[PDB]
Design a protein around this ligand. Structure first.
Ligand SMILES: Cc1cc2nc3c(=O)[nH]c(=O)nc-3n(C[C@H](O)[C@H](O)[C@H](O)COP(=O)(O)O)c2cc1C
Length: 138
């Protein structure tokens, strides 16, 4: 499996590692890839796309790297299963409600409720691992 994410300070990156840990504990292999190093073609061969990005700018997806990536794969993901996650600061998840609506609008099936954590996981570490376990059972 593959987990693609963008992280500015390391919060979403830590979530990605914990989600990966959950998948691995379930007995499956998984690779975490920063959005800057992804290969769209190899990624589209995956049955489930696991995507993460922190809340950036005015409650939007990170603009210089993550957003263009989403726009690039948008036309070729209809019917695919996707799991979304990310860290946020002062808001209440607006960017994620929009992200979920967007993915659904592209024809994707959002398999689980998006996982959002405020700031660094810390107390939510097990929640991240459990999310990976749910994804591994799909
Ligand atoms: C320029 C900028 C804009 C941000 N905008 C939002 C926002 O609109 N809503 C929110 O809750 N957090 C916002 N944040 C806070 C981040 O989402 C939060 O610090 C998160 O933990 C960062 O995770 P990361 O290290 O994975 O980037 C913003 C942070 C920065 C640097």
């Amino acid at each position: 499996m593959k987990i693609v994410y963008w992280s500015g300070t390391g919060n979403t990156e830590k979530m990605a590692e914990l989600i990966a840990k959950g998948i691995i504990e379930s007995g499956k292999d998984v690779n975490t890839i920063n959005v800057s190093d992804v290969n769209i073609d190899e990624l589209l061969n995956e049955d489930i796309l696991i995507l993460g990005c922190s809340a950036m700018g005015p409650e939007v997806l990170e603009e210089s790297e993550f957003e263009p990536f989403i726009e690039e794969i948008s036309t070729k993901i209809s019917g695919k299963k996707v799991a979304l996650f990310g860290s946020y600061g002062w808001g209440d998840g607006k960017w994620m409600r929009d992200f979920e609506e967007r993915m659904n609008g592209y024809g994707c099936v959002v398999v689980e409720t998006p996982l959002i954590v405020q700031n660094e996981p810390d107390e939510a570490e097990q929640d991240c691992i459990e999310f990976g376990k749910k994804i591994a059972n799909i």
